[PDB]
Amino acid sequence: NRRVNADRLWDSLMEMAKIGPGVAGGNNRQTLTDADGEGRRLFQSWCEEAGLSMGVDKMGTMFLTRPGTDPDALPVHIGSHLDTQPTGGKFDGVLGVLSGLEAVRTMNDLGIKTKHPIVVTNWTNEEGARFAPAMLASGVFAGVHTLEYAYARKDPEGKSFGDELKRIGWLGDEEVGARKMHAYFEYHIEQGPILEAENKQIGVVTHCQGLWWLEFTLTGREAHTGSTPMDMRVNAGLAMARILEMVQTVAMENQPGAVGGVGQMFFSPNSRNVLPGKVVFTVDIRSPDQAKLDGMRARIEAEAPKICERLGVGCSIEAVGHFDPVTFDPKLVETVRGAAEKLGYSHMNLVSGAGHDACWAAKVAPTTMIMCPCVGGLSHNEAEDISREWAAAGADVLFHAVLETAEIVE
Amino acid sequence: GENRRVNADRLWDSLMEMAKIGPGVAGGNNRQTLTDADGEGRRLFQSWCEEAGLSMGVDKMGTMFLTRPGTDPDALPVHIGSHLDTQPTGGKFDGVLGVLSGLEAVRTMNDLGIKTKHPIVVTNWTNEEGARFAPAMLASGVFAGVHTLEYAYARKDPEGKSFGDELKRIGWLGDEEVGARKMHAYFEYHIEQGPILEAENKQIGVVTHCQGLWWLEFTLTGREAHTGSTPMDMRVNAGLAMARILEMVQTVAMENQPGAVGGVGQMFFSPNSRNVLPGKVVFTVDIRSPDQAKLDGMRARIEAEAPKICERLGVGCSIEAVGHFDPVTFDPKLVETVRGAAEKLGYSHMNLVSGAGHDACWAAKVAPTTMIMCPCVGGLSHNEAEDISREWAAAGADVLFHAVLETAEIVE
Ligand SMILES: NCCC[C@@H](N)C(=O)O
Ligand SMILES: NCCC[C@@H](N)C(=O)O
Ligand SMILES: [Zn+2]
Ligand SMILES: [Zn+2]
Ligand SMILES: [Zn+2]
Ligand SMILES: [Zn+2]
Known part of the structure; x- marks a missing residue:
């Protein structure tokens, strides 16, 4: 009452x-x-x-x-x-x-x-x-x-x-x-x-x-953005861009009941004319379906290193958040x-x-x-x-x- | 001379x-x-x-x-x-x-x-x-x-x-x-x-x-929103727009070889929280060519395509030149x-x-x-x-x- x-x-x-x-x-x-x-x-x-x-x-x-x-x-x-x-x-x-x-x-x-x-x-x-x-x-x-x-x-x-x-x-x-x-x-x-x-x-x-927060650390090679020929660049920013696109695909192919996306990003050294030596970001993926969540995680963790390898970029992943x-x-x-x-x-x-x-x-x-x-x-x-x-x-x-x-x- | x-x-x-x-x-x-x-x-x-x-x-x-x-x-x-x-x-x-x-x-x-x-x-x-x-x-x-x-x-x-x-x-x-x-x-x-x-x-x-060079600083405007609970179809994702812009710059650079570069060294997300889609994404595209026509063509193409990428995602796009010489x-x-x-x-x-x-x-x-x-x-x-x-x-x-x-x- x-x-x-x-x-x-x-x-x-x-x-x-x-x-x-x-x-x-x-x-x-x-x-x-x-x-x-x-x-x-x-x-x-x-x-x-x-x-x-x-x-x-x-x-x-x-x-x-x-x-x-x-x-x-x-x-x-x-x-x-x-x-x-x-x-x-x-x-x-x-x-x-x-x-x-x-x-x-x-x-x-x-x-x-x-x-x-x-x-x-x-x-x-x-x-x-x-x-x-x-x-x-x-x-x-x-x-x-x-x-x-x-x-x-x-x-x-x-x-x-x-x-x-x-x-x-x-x-x-x-x-x-x-x-x-x-x-x-x-x-x-x-x-x-x-x-x-x-x-x-x-x-x-x-x-x-449930969620996974997968923190990626991508290793590129610091190099001059003016004078470095395109085919000598080790571009961790471009690897990150491809990963963000791939996460969007993964989320969309798991609809309904899936999200994937990125809110936090860091370049180092973050100079306008230096390709980044390090690019760090976190992929947030979620689903109420356990099998879907783990499938998205497995797929992202398998595809992202291949994206990087194609660009000569190092890839390390750490889970910095998770619950089923x-x-x-x-x-x-x-x-x-x-x-x-x-x-x-x-x-x-x-x-x-x-x-x-x-x-x-x-x-x-x-x-x-x-x-x-x-x-x-x-x-x-x-x-x-x-x-x-x-x-x-x-x-x-x-x-x-x-x-x-x-x-x-x- | 000699010595x-x-x-x-x-x-x-x-x-x-x-x-x-x-x-x-x-x-x-x-x-x-x-x-x-x-x-x-x-x-x-x-x-x-x-x-x-x-x-x-x-x-x-x-x-x-x-x-x-x-x-x-x-x-x-x-x-x-x-x-x-x-x-x-x-x-x-x-x-x-x-x-x-x-x-x-x-x-x-x-x-x-x-x-x-x-x-x-x-x-x-x-x-x-x-x-x-x-x-x-x-x-x-x-x-x-x-x-x-x-x-x-x-x-x-x-x-x-x-x-x-x-x-x-x-x-x-x-x-x-x-x-x-x-x-x-x-x-x-x-x-x-x-x-x-x-x-x-x-x-x-x-x-x-x-x-020559252009440094084009992009400011992309998204909508801060929870990365967990926001349905995919309601997201205004400036990070994804940025990713597509970086990819488009790489394409532009590759289609203009030899004698062209394009890339990004500087990036900022705001507020830069792991579970908040960014309200603002700022980065600088560096494009160069020894060929004037190629340089200006790359600039015009990038400035035409980037707003379209953003518009598809509901993202705002502003571009400022923060460096240039022919x-x-x-x-x-x-x-x-x-x-x-x-x-x-x-x-x-x-x-x-x-x-x-x-x-x-x-x-x-x-x-x-x-x-x-x-x-x-x-x-x-x-x-x-x-x-x-x-x-x-x-x-x-x-x-x-x-x-x-x-x-x-x-x-x-
Ligand atoms: N210091 C040598 C390189 C010059 C540089 N400000 C550039 O981005 O072209
Ligand atoms: N109000 C907080 C919602 C839960 C959040 N920290 C998350 O990322 O799921
Ligand atoms: Zn110098
Ligand atoms: Zn220098
Ligand atoms: Zn709360
Ligand atoms: Zn909260």
């Missing part, structure tokens, strides 16, 4: 958006920047004012706990991320974290007690923008990455994740992944166009498509659907297109996701947009799904 | 000493224009020149002019010029050989007690390379009236630092009006940066021409002088069309100009493994020396 405070939630989103603003009304609040520090501090202060106690793990993940009435009951987590892309929207990650805070504030308002404690979770470096892989803290949590692997990830300026975590003062004391969860929920914008296009308020997320398609916990999926039905919101099943911390939580606990629409499916763009009504409806569903799972006690 | 030759060892030592300033990671140099290492190199060069009796002037572009007087106080100077600034992956010999061969010619004239009618001016042009700040040949460009001082000063590097502020910072903002000097003649000695002299077993390149013909009288010097000295020689751009290309606009080349191993340049021998260096310096003496005129 009872709804969260839509205005309080919205105001919190607008306040958090002031921290680490981008250039176009979104956010550039990347993981382990001073702006990330400030956002974490603001979130902490709100949660502490709402009666939550804070724990922080050695990956900087923040766990804000509301007690249950059963002191041995495992917690129901509500998680997402406050770190953003360089061209981040105000809603990616933030909606889920702040909807957790609002769920708690509404429980406080209504004097609600639950059997299971509730833990609002802010995972470090979900985005994998500054340091790859994405979902890095939740990955250490679920036992997929070592702490030392995570700490040694570097940004483009050669700064290491571990040192930056230490720099901004968010190194916590808890062993990563020492917490066991009764259940994990994550509310997130769709980052796709389906809910909007289908006129559905709520995405009942059943699955998440995820199936969310079917019982919690039904809980989400039942919450939508109880509240009178339209819903449909979705397969998440993006990766989320929920994907790793799913390895160690019953996990599901809830989505609201976003305009044009636009995300990782500062123009990312949802309405107050969209935000609120999904937060209501989160609230009720959590209450059903954590169990209201009079 | 007046430069000191090969002194020249070589000077190259090896200068190579210690702003070393790269593989035995070459990363001594880019208007870095502190450039400052140190300039100061070392200055001190050597001053020890050889040369007097220094510096212009507002930081170009250094080191004068050996002549016997006629109204005679205009014969310049010997090149550049001490390097690429990030620079060789020890590109630019440096020409400047230090100037110093060596002067030291040899001093050793032999030679007097000339015309003064000799060893010239170190600022920012020939156009690595850090584009265009290349920036100071010689201002000198020859191609660029305004304010255009040059406003050039920015990838860190957003401006050329004018950096020039001032390292202390090389001089007082002379740029281009106030008139030259009787200009010579530039440079490594070939191509494989021909070595392959043809020739000691000296009698440079007759320099191939093929250069060097002064025939000075070419003959160079050839005659090689013949007098008994060096094997052949004619060359320079593949690279040089400060000489702008000097040619305002004075009788030519170039001399020596071989380099495998034609490799803009790579730290750039290599010449002591003997190659010295032979070309001898030719420079004799060409300069003929032009400046020995006075007993």
Whole structure:
């Protein structure tokens, strides 16, 4: 029956958006920047004012706990991320974290007690923008990455994740992944166009498509772009161009349910009149179909070296991100659907297109996701947009799904 | 003639000493224009020149002019010029050989007690390379009236630092009006940066021409979007447009052989996140030909096809020329002088069309100009493994020396 405070939630989103603003009304609040520090501090202060106690793990993940009435009951987590892309929207990650805070504030308002404690979770470096892989803290949590692997990830300026975590003062004391969860929920914008296009308020997320991030390092020969005869050039840029085209072909020949593309690129030494000695870029390929994902990976890894060999270019590939398609916990999926039905919101099943911390939580606990629409499916763009009504409806569903799972006690 | 030759060892030592300033990671140099290492190199060069009796002037572009007087106080100077600034992956010999061969010619004239009618001016042009700040040949460009001082000063590097502020910072903002000097003649000695002299077993390149260039900077506008969740049919992929442009440039280059090059050395994605399609992709296409019609045909074709590639993908396309000169013909009288010097000295020689751009290309606009080349191993340049021998260096310096003496005129 009872709804969260839509205005309080919205105001919190607008306040958090002031921290680490981008250039176009979104956010550039990347993981382990001073702006990330400030956002974490603001979130902490709100949660502490709402009666939550804070724990922080050695990956900087923040766990804000509301007690249950059963002191041995495992917690129901509500998680997402406050770190953003360089061209981040105000809603990616933030909606889920702040909807957790609002769920708690509404429980406080209504004097609600639950059997299971509730833990609002802010995972470090979900985005994998500054340091790859994405979902890095939740990955250490679920036992997929070592702490030392995570700490040694570097940004483009050669700064290491571990040192930056230490720099901004968010190194916590808890062993990563020492917490066991009764259940994990994550509310997130769709980052796709389906809910909007289908006129559905709520995405009942059943699955998440898998990914490989394959980082290519191509070795060319630095040479003068003026005086070097064409047939003596070892052109790693041209090899990269052919690889990008080949990735487009691979993605298109695996439709529907496949994507492939490149967002990050570096030439060295990156002089206008020097052919690059090194060209580094990451191919992002995804599919909800396991066999398709692995076929795309195998094909790209077989074809790309041949492209390079034809040009005399060296080719090295490193996986800097990976998870197989995820199936969310079917019982919690039904809980989400039942919450939508109880509240009178339209819903449909979705397969998440993006990766989320929920994907790793799913390895160690019953996990599901809830989505609201976003305009044009636009995300990782500062123009990312949802309405107050969209935000609120999904937060209501989160609230009720959590209450059903954590169990209201009079 | 017979017997007046430069000191090969002194020249070589000077190259090896200068190579210690702003070393790269593989035995070459990363001594880019208007870095502190450039400052140190300039100061070392200055001190050597001053020890050889040369007097220094510096212009507002930081170009250094080191004068050996002549016997006629109204005679205009014969310049010997090149550049001490390097690429990030620079060789020890590109630019440096020409400047230090100037110093060596002067030291040899001093050793032999030679007097000339015309003064000799060893010239170190600022920012020939156009690595850090584009265009290349920036100071010689201002000198020859191609660029305004304010255009040059406003050039920015990838860190957003401006050329004018950096020039001032390292202390090389001089007082002379740029281009106030008139030259009787200009010579530039440079490594070939191509494989021909070595392959043809020739000691000296009698440079007759320099191939022309366009540097076309593309700015492609895509739409930032999530690389996971965005359907393929909704993507506005500026990276893919760039890939197709690079491929089209390769096709253009290959269909225009022989005597054409096209390629890309510089690229930027924004925001350059692994899971964000780029909102902006910026890169520079370098196309060259010795043939004017071919050069302009390649430019017109690239500028016509690239917007079509982009339009097919919904990508915006903007093109700016950030460097250009038409093929250069060097002064025939000075070419003959160079050839005659090689013949007098008994060096094997052949004619060359320079593949690279040089400060000489702008000097040619305002004075009788030519170039001399020596071989380099495998034609490799803009790579730290750039290599010449002591003997190659010295032979070309001898030719420079004799060409300069003929032009400046020995006075007993
Ligand atoms: N909001 C983030 C979406 C998940 C993402 N880091 C990814 O590349 O899948
Ligand atoms: N330094 C020798 C090469 C000249 C160069 N600025 C070019 O791109 O042509
Ligand atoms: Zn997210
Ligand atoms: Zn995101
Ligand atoms: Zn040069
Ligand atoms: Zn050069």
